[model samples]
Target: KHAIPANIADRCLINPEQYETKYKQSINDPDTFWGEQGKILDWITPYQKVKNTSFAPGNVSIKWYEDGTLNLAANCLDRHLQENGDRTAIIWEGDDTSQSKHISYRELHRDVCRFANTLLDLGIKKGDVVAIYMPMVPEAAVAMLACARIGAVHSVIFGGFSPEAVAGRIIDSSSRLVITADEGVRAGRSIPLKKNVDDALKNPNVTSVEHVIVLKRTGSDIDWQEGRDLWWRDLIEKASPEHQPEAMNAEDPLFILYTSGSTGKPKGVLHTTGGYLVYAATTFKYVFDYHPGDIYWCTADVGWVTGHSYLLYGPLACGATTLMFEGVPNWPTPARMCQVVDKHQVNILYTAPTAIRALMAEGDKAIEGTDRSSLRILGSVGEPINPEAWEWYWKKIGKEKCPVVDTWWQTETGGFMITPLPGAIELKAGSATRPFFGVQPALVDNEGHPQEGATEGNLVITDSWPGQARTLFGDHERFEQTYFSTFKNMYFSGDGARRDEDGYYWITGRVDDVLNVSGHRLGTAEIESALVAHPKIAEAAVVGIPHAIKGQAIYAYVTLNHGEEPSPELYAEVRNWVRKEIGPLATPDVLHWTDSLPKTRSGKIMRRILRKIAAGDTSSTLADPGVVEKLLEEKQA
Candidate 1:
């Protein structure tokens, strides 16, 4: 274990004793503790009740500050304008290195207000759902803020998603408006975002979409629909920039972020106003050890929860200088991220393990001449970072000076649940180290028995926190069944974990069939369904195999329909078919053609055997040895 550097310890916000005391209070007297923490944001009306939560079976209810009223946009922008008006709210690094802009807090507020007015003019009101499918540009953040200002529930879809995937989400939410750009410029290439939205709206089932707002990015030509489509500039340029923020209840839905589940369809994780903001702000403040005037950068796209909490809401609410990067780490050159750090003098850097591992493979020369002297704290998110990648990030990038906070949380959790406080905890390369202030994590065995100290089991949170997702959008029963039903009252994390003797939590990958490929969660069932959608495919099974750069890679085993022959051309077609059906990220890395899959008498596919075979572990005993031998022989040949 690496001790905290003396300089960081001296300047950090919390010490070891303070962390322990606060953590104890937070867990023991959560109502009083969170009552104080919730004051971090300016509440329109102070909450009378602090915590009202329960995990009881058949009646799972979680509520925090349910009586309070607050405006999310005001907390992020308006309150900060008094003293931080001129401070840089967002430093946008564009796809091209030469193009960059610094948006001040005042400017951000003005833009958001104008956009809010435009949304109102187009018939959007409270409780309306808006779908935003744009790139990593500043406008994406502006669009989200605008929706929050007017009490609209914004669902920001990842730009990498295919038209079919976008259409499904839009239909699920019954979105009233769609916001997109003419094209999304990324890594020096253009993606036709407007064209994709156009195609998505062509679906007859997507009839809820009443309007489309297009940003003229890249100056790309797109098909225009009269009356239904409106240009962003035309609407916002003439709209009032002084629209009042709509007061929202603590229980009102803020956003619905869709995440993959064990089932084929994605689950819409719903987050509310007051509790989410308070939790996000508190976690961001301590986890990043962010101080005023610090330039913070979290290299995650706005579509993901990481970007929503850290990049947009958390940092902005704290009145900090947050940077929004629009380019990939390796594009134009391997040193793009390093160069950007030097160019902006970024103070705290938060990114994923996938980027760390990918950059580490390029060797030290990738960041040879870059100056990272301004960096004080580093972070790892999405998946458990390997020790090697952690070591490289600490030594090479930080020059052995910064503390690495490996955070473990999910879309449902809202913000950092298990993480290390820079000045308080000793650094363990791969472990998440400890739960945050109010989190109560426990390990339970397969039969729902609690495991004692220093053991491996399924991870679960015994109590509710402010940041936890309220429920699945429009599907409360599925939400309860998916999370609470598994372990009586505790919220099952669906991931396996181990607690060391020192009480640090080290996450083992998913216990469920979900795959964390390059920090993006993809359900194995989703991929299998995509593969089986092909006309010539009779059956398919998808599993996660360990990957060096991406934490996991998709391994698919497929059986062809009768009278169909498997060829190199067919293999390539099947892979691309999944890409088109879902998205590029869901494409199968390894495909194998087999006559049959080992299954039980009840006809359920035995994925355990397939996982072993995918990893090339032929030594393991299987129920049917001949079936494994045949697959091994074919693969080896």
Candidate 2:
């Protein structure tokens, strides 16, 4: 294998007898592999075994190192800072301006310690919840790490969320503290976050927010509540940064992350310490093929899981230099990304297909003479990449020779479940095509029977792996009913998919974005509710459209409120609405207007029809096309 695969073998430690044996053993005995991992975290009390569990989905419960107890935040920053006091830990680049700030490990440790102490001062304790709504500021990552450091479970709502969306999450998590910026600047305009936070906390039923910590992103005058609100600078500057981490059971919840899935309310997926840190670190190194000193960039908002794993924790854990960009990819220009690569010498570029296409749409001229030599690997996440974007990534950024790692996983899985390990797997352009070691995937027909290679079917993970969600928070039965009941014992991954003859996995988009992209499901209806935040929009429907870049481009059809006519300007309006309500990644590419949506007598939008139209299909396979006739007529006319 080395004669032909010399380059790959050298980089991935593959083909070597020791590496192969070790890899094989790790997969077979996660006990040894992950047992070594459990050692990475400093534990107060350690368990004897690596894990206790089964693939019986309905009854999924994994206790890593059974009696293990450790503090996650302590290992992440405190210990690292003790070893390397002044080393840079976080380097944040703002969106609206050229402002750049870097925090050394020592400084970051201090800030986290102070924040943790302040949370206690404000009466928040371990096992309590804190909800954070913040932009790409380093403070967002600080907030999460602080909670982990002190054992307070943190739930981060994507920063662009509306006040109402924030309220729902705050109430759902029963949060004791809400962290927000007084204002945020996007495209040179200020967002009134204080007003939104005030509105959300004002309600009689939503008073779990005992205190508010505000970041000064924009200089907006805030009407402060003496007892309930505090400034981050004032509080953090006054407290000490030296703090010890809270030791917790291996299965103890570290954070609650609400992610959109195939079902209705945002699923509050949980992540724990020892096992999760190991999995996150291991995947980050392999999937990105990271080498020491490689400056990595994952252009996802900290609000999303990509940021949680790739941007914030994974890269940091591997001791790789990760870039955090606050602005949109298109903000300064599509070329802004290339600019960062050149300026920072970014080695790994991880982003979504939609973002890649948006860059491609800016024309090759903008990308022509940029020095993209620093990019060693290109990556795609969130959704499957269309072949065109994959090719563009190889050509424009990678120069064709650089390895492209397309990953597939979700919030419930905690981190990358299936991904291309650079130099380890035969590189493929558009397909994730391979599963991570120890993961067994099955594609099943509607009846849950196995489907043949080259056939499409519902997907399932037949085996259990570390990093999987233990259970939905406060909803064990609902969790079982949703994921386990769908398939006898297999973890039903509610998405349609196909496997190639080579055993490569190609994801067919969501079986139902109606909630979660699939089973751990949060649906499109949730996004619809968030989009409806703008008083100007009466009705909105988000549908997935096929793309040459992202396999599915978000194509939206909005029925505006009365007197709100369809205008090209409305596209920007709806886009901002959704961007602010959900994350910008959820923003729609195109908007088509209509009188009434194609629906049945029960008032359900025949999404199958809208998906077909959005994909530009002219087939009569629609459940009902005539109902959409009037709407399309209005759109084009």
Candidate 3:
């Protein structure tokens, strides 16, 4: 067991005793507890109803501070202008080592106002959905806050996604405008972001898109549609820089983030304004033990929830200096992240386990020359960090002086759900430790029966928190069927977890058919659909197999069309086909060609048998034992 350092514990904001008291109050009297927490943000109209939530079947509703009035951008920017006007709000680290800049709170406010006015000039108004697809530049945050400033709901699509994925989300959301860049630079290569946006708009069904605003990142030539495309700088330069933030109701839609589900189509998870900001800000303060004037860094793309909460809104609302990086961990050099930490004098570092393992593979030389003395807290997110990677990060990256808070949360949950408070909770390798304040996590059997102590089962939350997603966009029934229908009067996490005797939760990956590959969620059905789209493929089934660096890797079982034999060239082509269909992240790690797939009597693909075979477990009983033998022989060959 690792104990908090003496000096670090002395500087902690909350002690163990304080955490216990607060936690008890949070559960016993949520109204009073969250009412006090709500005051953390500067609300335009303070809420009288603290919580109005229900988990009952057919009436699933969650609303926090429902009657309040506030603007999220104002809380994150306008409130901090007086005291932190000159303070660094964003420290943007470019992909190139020499390119970096600092934008103060006042500067951020002015830029957001200008961009907000530009959006208004382009016929955008409150409640309009604007799609933002850009790299990890400060403008990405500007676009988000600008939308919030004018009360527009911004949906950010990850830049790495292909045009088809982008078009699917756009058509689903019925977005009015698209915000993108000419190109994105990552690892010293150019990604055609605007080109992808153009390709997405080419779909005939994408009639809701009226305008496209493009930022000049690489100054690369892009095909433009007359009267529909406008340069970002040209619009912002002529717009006024004194726009007022619109006061929105507490339950107003903030953003819609699309996450892959067990089904083929990605579901749009919706978060509201006031509750999301409050939950994000409060959790950011306690989870990292954040203090004023601390230079914090969370290495996540703004498209992901971690970046939306921790990197942008959470830290900014707390009036803290947050660093934004546009580069990968191994770009330019293996020590880019360490170099940035030292260069910015970053205090708290939040990142993913996939990065830690990759850097750990490079040995001590990855962090040999850097002085990380400024680091006081370390964090891990996206997946359950393994003990070996966790230990190396604690000792090597933190120099054995900092505490690692491995946070476990999802896109559905706006902020940290199960995590360490750094100073308050004791460290347990690979365990998220305990539930955050007001979060009631329980384990249940497959039939939804509650499990007792020190047992393993599906994880479910008994009550609603401010950060939980209210519903899936435009599909309230799907939102209910996906989460609440599985377990009665509870929100299903779709993950299996083990609760230890000490009440620490150790997350055992996804219980559903989703794969957490390199910290990105990919649905198995989505990849399978992509594989079957190939002309040469007859059918495909995708499963997750254990991987060394990536927590899980995609293993595909393919059945080729009749009269077409599988060859090495076809294997490579099929893998690239999936990459083009979805994105590079969905590329299959292993492809096994077979004449047929194991199925039950009803013709349902028995994924369990395939999963076991991919994991190299030959001794397990299979319904079709002969088929397994033939597959194993072919694998050996």
Candidate 4:
């Protein structure tokens, strides 16, 4: 039986005996509970009220510590400087292992202030959205904090995103400035980030971009405009470091993180200042059991929410030493990740199951010589970790001496929602365990009736938590329609979940039009959009199917353009084209040629039909089920 280690019971935030009582009390009086926790964090101006919720009558809209004023950068960096000035704030590992650097709290604060001044000098102001398109360098974190320090909302685009993807986000956010690197060195390859920025700006539709600040990461030659492009070194080095931090209201927008929508366009999930900060800080503190000297590492790209909350703000606000590694886990060698743990003596390792499975594939030989005894806590994010991967991570990496905190949350939630408290609760293989304090989770049926226990249904949160997203950027109506309209007062999670006999949560991926392939939340429409981008592809439909290792694998059905033939060569060509367009991880596991995809009479693609066919259930109705059945037979063969 999985049991809480008796050794760590004294160190746990909530003792096993006190969980039910505390949880019931917290949910009963969330305002009082979260308010106390909110006050613990540094606030520039004390909040007048604890919570102003409007979930039932006027749809789901909440304001936690709304009347409060706070400076995020100050709390994360400035406050720490007085007591921990010389303490190592960030330990950056570059693409090449030799290119490592460290930043102290004092140094980090100075650089952040300098960058704030740089943004100020560039005519960027409060409320303006700035785009950060760079690698996971320490400067990237600095840029995000700099934006926060000056009251500018930063939207960080992943370094590997295509130019079209970048341009879509740029246009949607109406960003005036983009901060990028000359080139991002990852997996022994130099990705031309600045070049992509330039290409994205070339679109006349993206007219709001006034300037592009380029960081010289790889010192690679890039096409630059004298007026439009500014060197990061020149701007920061010459700027004064005496800039004042901007005080913002609790409800003011912090940052916009875009996630794929069911439609072709992605939705920009917006988070606010005070509530977001408090939620992130609280979750990180309790989830990982953060201490002063512990070196915490969340192996999430800064482009995603996990990186935003855990890798950056969450750890920093807690005054913990956070590690930022630029390279992949398998680069140089399969033991690269473990080597970093040994080198830095990282105590807490937070990562996705995809990386764990990838490392597991390398066999014991890869982890044979590495020493990872420093890790006392482990975490799983991005998506749920299966039992096999979970056990492997525990035995091989944690030495069965650490707690594996399989966290469950979303970009919309802003922070961890349901997860096992490392020292508090007994660890289960596939379960996220239970709700975080003040998170009121419910499992509702299709008709919106709550299920009691030993059952599975759509997951919803009945009450407002401080960490929930304020709205979708530029579309509050869509926010209500997507998340709130599903239920009367509850916020729909769009994911199916089951409550076990012990009342623990076990998340069963997305119930919506999204796919969790190897822990990455990819949209079916996004993959279809990528497939149709090929010259030979006339139409494409993508569906998620069961996969032993990846959890869910992509099954793509594509129709060729009128003149082109669907030869084996053409299939390989289209496959490679999609891999190039949407990165290699997004490549479809299986591809099948089709004259037409399964569609309803209303001209909508019947993805469920395709899903059934992909699962080898040919009994589903389709225009030509025989064709799909043959394909399935070939696949099985």
lDDT agreement with native, every candidate: 0.92, 0.74, 0.92, 0.87
User: What clash count goes with each model?
Assistant: 0, 27, 0, 0
Task: Give the per-residue lDDT of model 3 (tens digit) for 1-637.
Answer: 7998897789898889989999999999999999999998988888999888998888999999999999999999999998879999999999998999999999999999999999998999898999999999999999999998888999999999999899999999999999999999999999999999999888888989999999999999889899999999999999998987768999999999999988867989999998899999999999889889899999999999998999999998899999999999878777889999999999999999999998988988779789999999999999989899999999989999999999988999898899998878999999999999889999999999999989999999999999899999999889888999999899998899999999999999999999999999999999989988898888999999998889899999999889998789988999888887889999999999998587766767878878888998776444465787787876675
The better-scoring model by TM-score among 2 and 4 is: 4
What is the alpha-carbon lDDT for the whole of candidate 1?
0.92
Q: Which residue pairs overlap in candidate 4's backbone? A: none
> Which residue pairs show collisions in model 3?
none
Better model by lDDT: candidate 3 vs candidate 4 = 3
lDDT of 1 by residue, 378-418 (tens): 99999989898999999988889999999999999999999
Error of 4 at 219 (Å): 1.1
In model 1, where do residues sit more than 4 Å from their true spots?
A: 620-625
Candidate 3 regions with alpha-carbon error over 4 angstroms: 620-624
lDDT by residue (tens digit), candidate 2, 406-450: 888877777888777776667666788677755667888778898
Over 543-567, each residue of candidate 4 has an lDDT whose tens digit, in order, gives: 9988766778989888788877667
What TM-score goes with each of the models?
0.99, 0.88, 0.99, 0.96
In lDDT terms, how accurate is model 3?
0.92
